[PDB]
């Protein structure tokens, strides 16, 4: 292994499922809209874990995926200078990370005002988009609001998935948070501590690749990656990827 067999100061955080080529071959381009929930109750450790989770989730985005980050507490707003799904290249991801690290927790929560913002941003076709795999990531802790009406009105034929994350070590009700994922094609993840940050994003990628599998041999096409530096040092390389079913 390239530099981390057994060496001090040097911890091996490599995980193949997080590499650009794997994330490229494991699913199709996304339209994420990370709904952070910066309300009062998420302050303290839950907020630190939420911002670390959002950064490590933006890290699983390519240049073909489009992303925006919103945050809601009794009213929803974007966290950054962007107001629509922007391409997830290096500079936009850095802007979103710098805006998320500046986020503060205060106020009551309104899930309907946040999901309305999420769906209304995912229905904005005036911008360039990846018209595929529309997603909402809810980085809450827990609550008592399923908001069945807003999903019924905005996401009826279930074009948009909903992945709900219960970030933090707490004891609030996780019933609506586990329900939102079920009714809306999604999956429910738990991130109780730093160390569970790094696997649940890999897992949403695991979920997104079902319709790719159900399209048996149309999906087995070779895709070439952007020019990245190889893990085991040989400089600039591109890599072709083919999923294995």
């Amino acid at each position: 292994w390239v530099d981390n067999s057994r060496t001090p100061n040097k911890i091996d955080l490599y995980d193949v499922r997080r590499r650009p080529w794997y994330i490229q071959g494991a699913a199709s381009p996304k339209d994420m809209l990370i709904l952070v929930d910066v309300s009062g109750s998420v302050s303290g450790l839950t907020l630190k874990l939420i911002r670390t989770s959002v950064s490590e989730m933006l890290e699983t985005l390519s240049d073909d995926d489009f992303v925006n980050v919103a945050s809601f507490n009794s009213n929803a707003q974007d966290v950054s200078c962007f107001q629509h799904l922007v391409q997830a290249n290096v500079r936009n991801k850095k802007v979103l990370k710098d805006a998320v690290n500046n986020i503060t927790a205060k106020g009551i929560t309104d899930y309907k005002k946040g999901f309305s913002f999420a769906f209304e941003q995912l229905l904005n076709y005036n911008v360039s988009r990846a018209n595929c795999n529309k997603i909402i990531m809810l980085f809450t802790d827990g609550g008592e609001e399923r908001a069945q009406e807003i999903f019924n009105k905005y996401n009826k034929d279930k074009k948009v998935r909903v992945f709900t994350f219960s970030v933090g070590q707490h004891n609030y009700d996780r019933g609506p948070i586990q329900w939102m994922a079920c009714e809306n094609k999604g999956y429910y993840y738990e991130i109780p501590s730093i160390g569970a940050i790094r696997i649940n994003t890999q897992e949403y990628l695991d979920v997104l690749g079902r319709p790719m599998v159900l399209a048996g041999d149309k999906a087995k096409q070779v895709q070439w990656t952007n020019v990245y530096l190889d893990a085991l040092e040989l400089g600039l390389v591109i890599t072709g990827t083919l999923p294995v079913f």
Partner: peptide, 17 residues
């Protein structure tokens, strides 16, 4: 990209967690 795969009806939604 020209082609992408989402929203397949044969998909098994019973696996939230």
């Amino acid at each position: 990209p020209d082609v992408c795969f989402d929203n397949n009806v044969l998909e098994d939604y019973t696996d939230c967690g």
